[PDB]
């Protein structure tokens, strides 16, 4: 009855479909569990109608990102804005000391660079001589190079370098050291509407192709040579080809028994071992988001990128100065609670200087993300939690403490005072259709495995797509977009040839 | 009757000194170190100036501190005795344009950020690719500007290419003379400034029998007596015969060998002549001309925000319009042509503010070629030098919250007491600064021919004979350790039964 049945209406599946029509293939079905398209790409509205990409926001690797280039052409053709380069010089803030960026004495950015070169060398040509956690690596650097670091450097550098937790979505004691430093292939470009990207691709194919709210319960390719998909309601389908674009964490449920978990798909026969094994090489991180909407900017627009550093101590310097080796340092680093906004690094994007809107887009990581999303409905508790860092930022930006107007009450006094009006929070960790953010490595992992296995497919008519199925752009929106075009073209060439 | 020696080392630079240090360490005796000059050290020379202040007119920094073996030693000695031997003086660079003033970390130009994209762009252009034409660095920057003009503001397309050029001071070559493939390279760690590079030379020099050192003997010829004996002739007539010889003369000096006319200072006549593999490598590698000029002042009366300052060359608004209207590659290569002398603003200059880093009231400035050759050819005229550099000197002081300088060579303003200049392009024993690449060059050729040797007895060492640390002090040092270890390995066989 059907040529190709794409499961999932995320950018991956959507591009796939988009491509199939663009190639004259017809009778295709797009089955999506949610009541919307866009997958991990969702734009939401808040105060006064403002819009934000609570999911993906940036176009990365702009020098080689195909999707970006495409958006570039369009914009070059009709003078319509679609993005803005928001990269800037980072302002780093330590609760007690204030700004620590571009400091004439600390030179944190400079030693941070040495630190990364230190990493590269540690894992170069050695098969990766036993990989450890990002935290472990950082401790080695300090120990080995202590003779060439001041006290403050040993103290503040380790906290500053942790901004990388916001790229992976994992705490430095849970992140693989070997996969921490990536290749920054160019400047980043803030997408003024990833939804526009989603709608354009979405419209590009026959609308009667989309089937929202069709959670797929099980896939089975009868040796008869065709695939049989069954949604959760009962409606059955049969197709020549099928492209599973569900996220990795969800597909990881297929290997567990007692499959009843929302989203889980039952394959038959099961997934070949090369696939099941891939999951032991870990994966899935938890980057989260929190939006702070204000009445109107009343703070310095010096930079669009701000990072708050976790607290640090002087006893730490001393401990590093006295340790006689890694072992001693380890055990010595044993001090005996409760998490606060200064327990981990936090990344704020000042949307004022980059888009004009008086709002801060913040990024958080595991384990904090999971916790903050659990209390997303409790605005009060959310305010109390972030207030202390929200005030520190305003101070270092020539302003004053933040006023809680989430339960508005007009008052002139709030002339040039910052007034919070709304707070928005992601929920990717508690949404059974995503269960996290995107692929990520724990120490001892190897991403190549999944990429290969996925890209090989279960067999001939069963293929996979999405950010966890490709190398270039791994974990990214453009990575997924290309994995979708990958399966469509391959099948497109086959159909065109069969007759 | 010509004296017998086990090993004769020609040249007393850090390479040869280390070669000898190693021989003695491995127990070899009856050796010799012959040097043309009347001092040891070579391109590691420390001079004295106003009020007895000191400066390294040759090498100044230990590079790649994370792996630099020579740097690690000095670090061990300080760790066990508390004596200051070096200092980490890296910093936040201050960039200055004559018209616009400081353009570093400017919230709208964001120059450093696009420079990183530039380098990444270059990396994707070459790194790991096969059969890619080379072209000059200048051309690479023109290509980047073309392919990304849609994502660069007008003012960015103007100033970014001028900031890019700080690299000219690492290679000692102007951007149109520089190989683009060899322009970008990896920096393994921070740089540590030597507080007495001549202090490193002596330690190594005092680690072997002092009767070995023969200064002021220039070697005129080296001959292999087909019987495992090498003859060496000093100009003063002494004749020596030894089993092995480590030749460490500069690559620019050894090049003189592949030419007729032996009355040139430094030239060594080889018999038989250097194998064709060696003469031919001279066509695939060249020599740069980094240079220095020290400006000494009475006292510091300027800001010590940073110790690294770079002044950009003038840029125009027409360049922009051309970049915007450019059609393709050739169209730009064409349009770029107009119709004029050279001044201090005709090329980027790199100033080191010693007052912050060492506490001395002076600037150490680095220059590239062609400027270095012209500036060293007038080093004797201090008045002319002061004029030439006065405008940038003023601009700097202005930006560092001070005022125009006062020629005091012959109380709230900066007074210039003395100027010191390099002499490498003119000294017949240097003939330049160090090995560098021209577009289309292949340094690997020289290293291979060099480290392989003339034959089993006639060996080579020096900054141009090794891959890791090429052109650097630690590269020459290691190259010395290498040739000596090999010889030690071979004489060791004399004790077997
Ligand atoms: C907070 C956050 C920020 C991010 N920021 C960036 C960024 O700045 N830049 C960037 O490049 N990337 C970013 N990413 C990553 C990027 O969003 C993803 O790589 C990409 O969207 C994954 O695409 P996909 O098509 O594979 O899946 P889409 O979510 O991404 O999901 C696949 C589809 O499968 C559907 N599905 C699941 N189970 C079933 C079932 N049983 N039956 C039917 N359908 C099902 C889902 O509902 C979904 O629509 C971010 C991710 C997060 C979470
Ligand atoms: C301006 C300048 C700045 C520099 N800055 C740095 C820096 O910051 N960091 C760094 O790592 N490197 C730097 N270098 C490079 C470094 O100085 C060299 O790599 C290193 O000194 C080369 O050592 P060498 O032992 O091979 O030769 P030395 O010159 O370098 O030369 C070998 C010796 O041969 C002798 N000789 C020549 N001909 C004869 C002959 N016919 N008979 C007898 N003896 C002869 C010479 O007098 C000399 O002493 C710089 C170089 C210059 C010119
Ligand atoms: N400091 C901002 C980091 C943003 C990292 C986004 C990573 C997206 C990976 N798919
Ligand atoms: N800001 C430029 C610094 C350049 C230092 C060059 C050292 C070169 C040693 N061969």
Curated annotation (Swiss-Prot), chain B:
Instruction: List the InterPro entries.
Output: Amino_oxidase, FAD/NAD-bd_sf, Flavin_monoamine_oxidase
GO cellular component, alphabetical, reads: cytoplasm
Tell me, what does this protein do in biology?
Involved in the production of beta-alanine, a precursor of pantothenic acid. Multicopy suppressor of fenpropimorph resistance.
Q: Which reaction does it catalyse?
A: spermine + O2 + H2O = 3-aminopropanal + spermidine + H2O2; spermidine + O2 + H2O = 3-aminopropanal + putrescine + H2O2; N(1)-acetylspermine + O2 + H2O = 3-acetamidopropanal + spermidine + H2O2; N(1)-acetylspermidine + O2 + H2O = 3-acetamidopropanal + putrescine + H2O2
Which Gene3D superfamilies does the entry link to? 3.90.660.10, FAD/NAD(P)-binding domain (3.50.50.60)
Q: What family is it from?
A: Belongs to the flavin monoamine oxidase family.
- The protein's name is Polyamine oxidase FMS1
Out of the domains of life, which is the source? Eukaryota
């Amino acid at each position: 009855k059907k040529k190709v049945i794409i499961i999932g209406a995320g950018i991956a599946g959507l591009k796939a479909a988009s491509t199939l029509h663009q190639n004259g293939i017809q009778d295709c079905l797009v089955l999506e569990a949610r009541d919307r398209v866009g997958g991990r790409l969702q734009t939401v509205t808040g105060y006064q109608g403002r819009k934000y990409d609570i999911g993906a926001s940036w176009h990365h690797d702009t020098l080689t990102n195909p999707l970006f280039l495409e958006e570039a052409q369009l914009s070059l053709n009709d003078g319509r804005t679609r993005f803005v380069f928001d990269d800037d010089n980072f302002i780093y803030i330590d609760e007690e000391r204030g700004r620590v960026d571009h400091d004439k004495e600390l030179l944190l950015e400079i030693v941070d660079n040495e630190m990364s070169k230190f990493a590269e060398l540690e894992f170069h040509q050695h098969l990766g001589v036993s990989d450890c956690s990002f935290f472990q690596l950082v401790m080695k650097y300090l120990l080995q190079r202590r003779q060439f670091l001041t006290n403050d450097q040993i103290r503040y550098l380790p906290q500053l370098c942790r901004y990388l937790e916001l790229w992976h979505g994992l705490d430095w004691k849970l992140l693989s050291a070997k996969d921490t430093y990536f290749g920054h292939q160019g400047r980043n470009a803030f997408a003024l509407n990833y939804d526009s990207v989603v709608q354009r691709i979405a419209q590009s194919f026959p609308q009667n192709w989309l089937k929202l709210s069709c959670e797929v319960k099980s896939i089975t390719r009868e040796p008869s040579k065709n695939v049989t998909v069954n949604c959760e309601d009962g409606t059955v389908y049969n197709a020549d080809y099928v492209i599973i674009t569900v996220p990795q964490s969800v597909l990881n449920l297929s290997v567990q028994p007692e499959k009843n978990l929302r989203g889980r798909i039952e394959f038959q026969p099961p997934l070949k071992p090369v696939i099941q094994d891939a999951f032991d090489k870990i994966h899935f991180g938890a980057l989260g988001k929190v939006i702070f909407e204000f009445e109107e900017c009343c703070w310095s627009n010096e930079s669009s990128k701000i990072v708050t550093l976790a607290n640090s101590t002087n006893e730490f310097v001393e401990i590093v100065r006295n340790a006689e080796n890694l072992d001693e340092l380890d055990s010595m680093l044993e001090r005996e609670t409760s998490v606060t906004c200064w327990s981990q690094p936090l990344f704020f994007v000042n949307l004022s200087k980059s888009t004009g809107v008086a709002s801060f887009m913040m990024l958080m990581q595991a384990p904090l993300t999971n916790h903050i999303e659990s209390i997303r409905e409790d605005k009060e508790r959310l305010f109390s939690f972030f207030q202390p860092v929200l005030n520190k930022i305003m101070k270092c930006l020539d302003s004053e403490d933040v006023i809680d107007g989430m339960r508005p009450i007009e008052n002139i006094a709030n002339a040039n005072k910052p007034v919070l009006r709304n707070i928005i929070v992601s929920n990717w960790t508690r949404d059974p259709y995503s269960r996290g953010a995107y692929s990520a490595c724990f120490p001892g992992d190897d991403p190549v495995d999944m990429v290969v296995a996925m890209s090989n497919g279960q067999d001939s008519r069963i293929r996979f797509a999405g950010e966890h199925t490709i190398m270039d752009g791994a974990g990214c929106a453009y990575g997924a977009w290309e994995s979708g075009r990958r399966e469509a073209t391959r099948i497109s060439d086959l159909l065109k040839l069969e007759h």
